Amino acid sequence: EGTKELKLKKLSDNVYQHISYKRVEPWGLIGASGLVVINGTEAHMIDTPWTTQGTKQLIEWIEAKGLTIKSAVVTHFHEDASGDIPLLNDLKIKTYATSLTNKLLKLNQKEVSSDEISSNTFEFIDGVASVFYPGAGHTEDNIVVWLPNEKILFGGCFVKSLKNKNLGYTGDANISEWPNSMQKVINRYPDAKLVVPGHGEVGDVSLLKHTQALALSAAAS
C-alpha cells in the first residue's frame, strides 16, 4: 500500500511507476508520476519523487530488490521532476539533464546534473530508454522518454492527463510552441501504447492529442 510519501505501480516486469503528491496553489492536491526502469540488475529513475523522504524510500525499495540504482534522468527543471538532484549527486548516482534544463537549474541557483545531455535525442539506457527533446511546451526544457521494448512514453509535465481541463502551471510555459512540439511527439511515437503524464492518470496516445488541443485553446484565449 506504499508509504505516506510514495506509492509504486508495476507497469511491466521492467517498468514501475513511482507516485507522490503535493498541494500546489491554486490547483490544490495533485499527483505526480515518474518511472523506475530495470535493466538486468541495474535500475534507473525517470524524475525523482516529489519529496526527499519519497526519494530515499524509493532508493531503499530498489536496493531491497537486489538492484543497483545506476542513474536518473530529470525531464524538466521544476521540483516535481528534478527536486532530488542534490541527494542523488551526494550518493554518487549519475544524474542526467539537458543543457537547457541545467541552464534553468543554474538560473534558479539549483545544483546541476552530473552528466549533461547535449543532443535532441539521447540513449539514456542503451536499447531500453531514449530521450527526445520535442521543443518548448510546459517549460522551455521539457523532454520525453521513450521505452521502445514496452511502447511506454513518459510524457512528464509536457503531457496533461485526459481529464485535465487546463494546462496547469503556465508561468514557465511556451503556449504558442506547445502544439508544434506536441505534433513532433505524435509523429515520432504513433506506436505508443501507454502515455504517462507528469500529473494524473496514465492513458493511451489520446493524451498527446488532448494536450495539443488544450494548448491550442489556451492560445485562442
The residue whose Cβ lies closest to Zn ion is: 78
Residue 137 vs 179, nearer CB to Zn ion: 137
DSSP conformational letter for 2 = -
Asked if the bond preceding 179 is cis, omega within 30° of 0, the reply is: no
- Residues in the interface with Zn ion (CB under 5 A) total 4
- The pattern of x and - marking residues 79 through 118 that bind Zn ion according to CB under 5 A reads -x--------------------------------------
CB-wise, 80 or 84, nearer to Zn ion?
80
- Which of 67/202 has CB closer to Zn ion? 202
Q: Does 18 bind Zn ion (CB under 5 A)?
A: no
**Pick from 200, 215, 212: nearest CA to 167:** 215
Tell me the residue type at 122: F
Angstrom CA distances, 179 to 85, 162, 210, 211, 213, stand at 29, 16, 10, 8, 8
- Single residue of 78, 113, 146, 214 touching Zn ion by CB under 5 A: 78
CA of residue 111 relative to chain centroid, distance: 18
Q: What is the 3-state secondary structure (H, E, C) of 132-147?
A: ECCCCCCCCCCCEEEE
User: Binding to Zn ion by residue 198, rule CB under 5 A?
Assistant: yes
Stretch that binds Zn ion, among 64-72, 94-102, 156-164, 174-182 (CB under 5 A): 156-164
138 labeled part of a ligand binding site: yes
- Binding segment toward Zn ion, per CB under 5 A, in 41-49, 61-69, 70-78, 145-153: 70-78
**137 and 180 in contact (C-beta within 8 Å)?**
no
Candidate ranges 10-18, 77-85, 93-101, 120-128; the one touching Zn ion (CB under 5 A)? 77-85
Rounded CA-CA distance 73/96 in Å is: 5
Nearer to Zn ion, 14 or 138 (CB): 138
Distance CA 153, CA 138 (A): 16
The answer on whether 18 is annotated among ligand-binding residues is no
Q: Is 76 annotated as a binding residue?
A: yes
For residues 46 and 109, what is the distance between their CA atoms, to the nearest angstrom? Answer: 22
Q: What angle do CA 153, 165, 11 make, to 5 degrees?
A: 25
- Residue closer to Zn ion, measured from CB, 38 or 45: 45
Using CB under 5 A as the criterion, which residues of the chain lie in contact with Zn ion when the complex forms?
78, 80, 157, 198
Annotated binding site: 76, 78, 80, 138, 157, 199
